[PDB]
Symmetry: D2
Subunit: 386 residues, 4 copies
Amino acid sequence: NYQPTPEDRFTFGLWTVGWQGRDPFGDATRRALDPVESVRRLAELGAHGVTFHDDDLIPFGSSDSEREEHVKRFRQALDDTGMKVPMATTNLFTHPVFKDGGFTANDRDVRRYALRKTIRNIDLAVELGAETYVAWGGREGAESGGAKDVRDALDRMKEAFDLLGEYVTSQGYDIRFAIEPKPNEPRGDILLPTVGHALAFIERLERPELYGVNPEVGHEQMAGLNFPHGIAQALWAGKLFHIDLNGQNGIKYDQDLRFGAGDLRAAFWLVDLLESAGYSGPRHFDFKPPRTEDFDGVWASAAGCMRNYLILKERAAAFRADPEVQEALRASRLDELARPTAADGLQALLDDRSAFEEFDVDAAAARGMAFERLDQLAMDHLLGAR
Amino acid sequence: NYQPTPEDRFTFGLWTVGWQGRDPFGDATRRALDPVESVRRLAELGAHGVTFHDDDLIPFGSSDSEREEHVKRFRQALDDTGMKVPMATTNLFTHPVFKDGGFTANDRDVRRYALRKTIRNIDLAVELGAETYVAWGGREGAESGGAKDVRDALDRMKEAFDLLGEYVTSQGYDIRFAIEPKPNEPRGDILLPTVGHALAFIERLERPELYGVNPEVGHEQMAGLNFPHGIAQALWAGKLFHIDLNGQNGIKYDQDLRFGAGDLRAAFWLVDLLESAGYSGPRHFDFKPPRTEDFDGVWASAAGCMRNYLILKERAAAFRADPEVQEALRASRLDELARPTAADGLQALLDDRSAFEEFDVDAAAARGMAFERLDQLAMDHLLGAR
Amino acid sequence: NYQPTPEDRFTFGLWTVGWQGRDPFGDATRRALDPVESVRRLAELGAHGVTFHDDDLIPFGSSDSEREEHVKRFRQALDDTGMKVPMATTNLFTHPVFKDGGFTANDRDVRRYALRKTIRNIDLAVELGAETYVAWGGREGAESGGAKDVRDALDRMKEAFDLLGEYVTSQGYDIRFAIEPKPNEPRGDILLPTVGHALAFIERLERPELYGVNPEVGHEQMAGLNFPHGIAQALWAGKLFHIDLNGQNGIKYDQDLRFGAGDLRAAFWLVDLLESAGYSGPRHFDFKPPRTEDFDGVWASAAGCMRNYLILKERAAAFRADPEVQEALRASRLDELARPTAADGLQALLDDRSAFEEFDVDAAAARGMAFERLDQLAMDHLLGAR
Amino acid sequence: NYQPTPEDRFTFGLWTVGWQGRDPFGDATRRALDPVESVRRLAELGAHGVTFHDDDLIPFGSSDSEREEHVKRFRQALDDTGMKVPMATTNLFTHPVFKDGGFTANDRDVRRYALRKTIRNIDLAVELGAETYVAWGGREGAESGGAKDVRDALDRMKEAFDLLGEYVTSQGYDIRFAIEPKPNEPRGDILLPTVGHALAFIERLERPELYGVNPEVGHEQMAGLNFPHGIAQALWAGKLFHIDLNGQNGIKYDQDLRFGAGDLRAAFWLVDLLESAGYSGPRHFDFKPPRTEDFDGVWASAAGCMRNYLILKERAAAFRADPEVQEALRASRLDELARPTAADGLQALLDDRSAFEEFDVDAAAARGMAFERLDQLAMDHLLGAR
Ligand SMILES: [Co+2]
Ligand SMILES: [Co+2]
Ligand SMILES: [Co+2]
Ligand SMILES: [Co+2]
Ligand SMILES: [Co+2]
Ligand SMILES: [Co+2]
Ligand SMILES: [Co+2]
Ligand SMILES: [Co+2]
């Protein structure tokens, strides 16, 4: 079962199924895919849409006539299949000119070029219907301490994002930005390394309402963080504008495994939170079919991303709907966690002897939280062992 | 040389040199220290002051007469030595009542008690002259996904911090709060796990100006992050209200080694940034003399925290003052990083053919950043090998 | 379903369900358990047996009459329940005398005492029927580089293990040793940090046949390693004498979560390998019910260790027995991996033009490994989604 | 000062200074270097020699006449400069045919080809005077659990190494093998992930004396391990046949920073151990000048590898020679660590009441180890702050 359809809003980057398998130690293992063929294959699997970097759709250095033809073929494939383009982004990391950054390159001419390259692709993104424009500053950072003054780099990164907000406002575009954190790789340390740092940075932009985050499962896990907890803080802040789904085994190079691989229980709690919270954005996969695979394995890996999301969605819904789980959640006081601490106000709390002088600390300490019984009901639901 | 004096503003927690050596697998290796003796010994070493949790100064469950006598003896030791108390904090983690949290415990009665316990110690902190009140929510978090809804927990954590801000405002106190992130330990994941998450959270409090961060070297390193980069983002945001200095070897349990141990080059770049930025707060050590040590080793370890800061301060100042380093920083375009990208404005950037149509991308890509020569001058300065 | 019975050979340490909840930052949350009560409760859950450190069964410093009474009560509980004692071990880590090690303490008198304490408990272990005697050198190591010369420490560690082998041989005992690696915690680095280092060390003991490894899920995961791969290398070497089962979330402090928690897919592949290989030793749990729990939560957490093993055993058996998986394993050439590379011999390989001069490297490179389809069949079996 | 000369035995791989800067997310930033030019530039810096993979010296797929000309030009550069070739190795990782491994590929034809490719380059290595032949099985491993049965893969890896030992013995060559562990990257988990696993594996080869390890600083640090401790265990086993020197910041992708970068104190203790132990092999750098650099930065980064080794060699020698350090080492009982525990024998230990019945455990526990004073003397020596 678990068959995706376009109504599930699953999307994939052209660069995901199109990854040719080159890595730090290895040459390509697959031929390049035409974006037209990836749109057709993904639609056959039940995807809703695709996303692109500028340079995935239009080879870098293309003439205007070449650009127009690449976009015309791609639009025909979208129209032939009903696929959408909800998100686009800029490649500010592959070309050697970006070796020290795009928006925070030490060279000022490079920073200006990075902005012009981004702006040209925002116009194209809006042409193709994108609602979200992602920015992953993979080259922003350093391998050594003297190379990059981070307060000056954050001043340049704020100027860049502010200028992009002024551009979209000036054009009357509805598109919003989603900043994608990553802690390292390819730079030794990347600026805005986690969801928290990106959220904090956005609050200092001139028009914060135009910007949110695009967290990626594997990126937060490369810092050993809890990805569902970081998504909860982004939702709490109203800033989950987009999300990248994949798998990662803890603290390593960015593996980009299919979604559901890597930390399976974290995938379960992530789906439980997105579905509980009513997240309505695309369920986007930023993954790489392993370079061991041929094209049949590429499409099997892409299909597995969607299948795993739909299995986990069913099991998380059954967990939350089970009367036995609902009783366990009240036994563990999840209902009390959702009640205000002191709606009575500060003076009432200060005058409340039950909160201090007559609080029986030992009786409260003795009360078990019952978290292990609750977690084994969660395990039983995930494994289909109820 | 490298002799600290009280003018260097070095401070230590009572619980640092007073740690008796109990760990997950081991009993105490040292007897308890009277706070009066730790104040006298630290002052002899050249410290400026000390800090405390409530329960380090006044044993938990003390009567009012016992509380008054503990505080009177401590005040006499401060007066005898000239030591200050710049910071205090609450212990919301040791007693079993806090096993699921203080401010975000699922039990509402526990959350109210945690607030009352904190408020009682804010009054004492102000009595003793503290300017900063730290909050390390070490028990806020979870070992399992169903135990803690993080959006509800952040709602409780905001209510708690807002009530503390209303209390200090109502009393006319000048004290400010500093939230201390940690990614895990003792909980499997701790809420507000990094400097970024704490900065983002503060922006949603009702009176954000009252709150900053108290980052700790080892805590950000437990997530594999670059501690100088996170301090730069806190400085950029105007939120470095306090800092905890120690050593850590990467991604492990919290080691709390003396400052300068663990990642030595990160200690160098940290001191370079604090001194360059003119940070004026205490240089506070939150460390543990290893449990292998006797009391002579406790004081040698405390002395080493201050010595290492002063050696690194000298070498970072010599690096920044060296004409050869200043020329290397211009060769690596650190001066251009500090210039605005587009003070000419968005329309001028859009009309600038030198930023796109006539930008020679290959000539810019060919220009080396000269970062390795700059970093080996930094290495040579740190090692005294110029 | 998934009800364990003593025939499943599940065992637990007294110190697991008996953990009182003390951690680096927290006091006990549960009262001490009498070993007699833990034997009765574990037997009711379907355990096969229990294991102990000397000091869990006989308080440190007990008189001979106290020792005899503790052992007599424990033996009565074993006889009343039918529980076994397959393994015992020494506590060479809690008492402050072991602050720098037992067998590799810098103090020679401490090393001799550690050996005498171990030998006294080997005699008791044999009295109680244990076949395996574990040694976890949690204090062997260092926080600083000058404190511990590791070649001298390995010379002391080999002398200690050789003397223990001479003792068991001299007594005619059948018991064998199992060395338990851990990479860090409580020492900053622990000697013999992984399964590989322990296996390599054993090959240099005088009677290597007497020693194997007791790997623990969470310990290898604290180094970011693949626990099933390390168990495969221990099985390949004939050295898996015992195993400790629990859960861990990657690279952190040792969490000791119940088995099946932490890395669930690694738990699946571990059970698949132990069952495929016909491992016949105890399935021992070295875990800690979280300190949030009361005693009801302790027994629920212990029950969950066994339940998760039995669910994973069923799903791994169904995976290996499924004709569709067997066809996928041949499509991925798992059958060819198990065939000798060159049973024809070196000269035949050198003379084989199909291995070099006429090997079509591009045709072989083009053949996909089909690993993603195989892994999604594994995912579907684990989740009960076939 | 700190000028290297060929007598310091510093060597570099052609692929180190020749790295063109391609990474998972980026195109080359530097042109290819002719090996003749790298030999000349490295000799000018004071290197002793160079090392190569087959495919660095002879492009893959070269004809015999092309092979002969590449080798003739390289030999002329060695003769012109006096540079040596102490080590060579095979590239069994770049070409797509090795996407699932060389020696442990699931495809048997690939395993046979990997052996033939290795054997052809052993002959060339011996022609050029190499004493050590490295094997880094970077493709041996898996991203998923069903793809690779590790006991079958270890059987194939032992067959491969045994056949290589039979080949060198049959030819009467003096060359020895050095197996290079790495825990992950490019495979999700690599087989023989650490020094310990490689040492353990070697003991099961048919002629173990022909094989040792080639540990790399950054590889063991990618598992969070202590690299000096792993080198000490390799020295203890008599198996340090070669070593790769570089820098790494903990648990991340393999950074290959210049030696002395990354964990500086670990670099200090490594040099102290190699020099103390009288290691006589090459001091080989396996590093990558960052892709931010031009060729001037490549040679500055290479020069910095050698400079940092020579600074650390001076400071470690001064530490060990300082009478104050020698007194601190006796205060910390490093002398007692080097004395046998029980040269009196097992029966004497059993009859020694001073080892048990009359051992004053509390007096021994009270004695501090004085490790912090010793470590701050080490810090002071490293920083030139005595
Ligand atoms: Co990624
Ligand atoms: Co992404
Ligand atoms: Co800490
Ligand atoms: Co702290
Ligand atoms: Co453990
Ligand atoms: Co264990
Ligand atoms: Co490397
Ligand atoms: Co290497």
